């Protein structure tokens, strides 16, 4: 529900 | 009358798109092999290239005008609302209506409607997908038209979870007004006939793909056997 790849590929 | 910042949005567009998809395809020698002889035999190669795809969705999404201004939240519901939707836009430039398949290169890279069923989805989603990318490959729209749509598509201020709706709802009022302009001022007739209004009722049979692809993906990864050929990426974007 926390989204920690999506996040570090929007850097 | 399209102006310098019109024109520049376009070129920002263009060149994310550029940097984002890779015509050759070169990168589909990385993916599990598509196996064509539950036996859900294309689900690995499948999932690979979703997954390739969603990457390549969210690099196209971080140069947007704007978007990355946004909350990270915000950008993060955008892309999760609208990854599938946007796959389904940006794989209608290797949509053929030779044979309606997806030619990406060579005979291994050709999907027809035997992989999406050998990926788990029925026809319930494959049939609107096929008169989609019919209908989206007959507007032949230009390069311009094309990436403003998934821009269009990918910042709308409707998406469940959104905070920001009025600054999401600004950045596609832009992009909007940029692709109305685009279209009278450099489409030719008769291809600009009802073109805009014709784009926009393609994001509302998206919406529709949307759905039906949620639910049939909801009963799919509910199998852990299933899940299992799926990618972290996949199971991230479009849930668990
Ligand atoms: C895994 C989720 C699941 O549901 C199974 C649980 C399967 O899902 C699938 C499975 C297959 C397909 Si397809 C119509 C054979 C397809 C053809 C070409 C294509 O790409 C060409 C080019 O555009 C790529 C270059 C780029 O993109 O940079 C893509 C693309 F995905 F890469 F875009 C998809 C769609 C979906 C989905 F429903 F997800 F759309």
């Known amino acids: 529900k926390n989204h920690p790849m999506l996040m570090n590929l929007l850097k | 009358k399209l102006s310098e910042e019109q024109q520049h949005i376009i070129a920002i567009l263009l060149d994310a798109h550029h940097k984002t998809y890779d015509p050759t395809y070169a990168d589909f020698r990385d993916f599990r092999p598509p196996v064509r002889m539950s036996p859900l035999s294309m689900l690995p190669h499948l999932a690979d290239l979703v997954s390739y795809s ?30 599938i ?6 794989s209608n430039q290797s949509f053929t209506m030779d044979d309606m398949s997806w030619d990406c290169g060579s005979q291994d890279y050709k999907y027809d409607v035997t ?8 026809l319930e989603l494959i049939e609107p997908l096929i008169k989609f990318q019919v209908g989206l490959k007959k507007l032949n729209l230009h390069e311009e038209e094309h990436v403003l749509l998934m821009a269009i598509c990918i910042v709308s ?84």
């Open chain 2, 85 to 90: 939707e946007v796959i389904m836009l940006r």
């Open chain 2, 115 to 122: 992989d999406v069923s050998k990926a788990g989805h029925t």
């Open chain 2, 54 to 83: 969603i990457q390549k969705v969210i690099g196209f999404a971080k140069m947007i005008p704007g978007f990355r201004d946004l909350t990270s939240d915000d950008q993060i519901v955008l892309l999760k609302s609208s990854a």
């Open chain 2, 157 to 240: 201020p409707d998406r469940p979870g959104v905070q920001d709706a009025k600054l999401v709802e600004a950045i596609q009022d832009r992009l909007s007004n940029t692709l109305q302009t685009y279209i009278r001022c450099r489409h030719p007739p008769p291809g600009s006939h009802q073109l805009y209004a014709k784009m926009i009722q393609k994001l509302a049979d998206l919406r529709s793909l949307n759905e039906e692809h949620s639910k049939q993906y909801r009963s799919l990864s509910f199998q852990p056997e299933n899940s299992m050929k799926l990618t972290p990426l996949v199971l991230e974007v479009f849930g668990n």
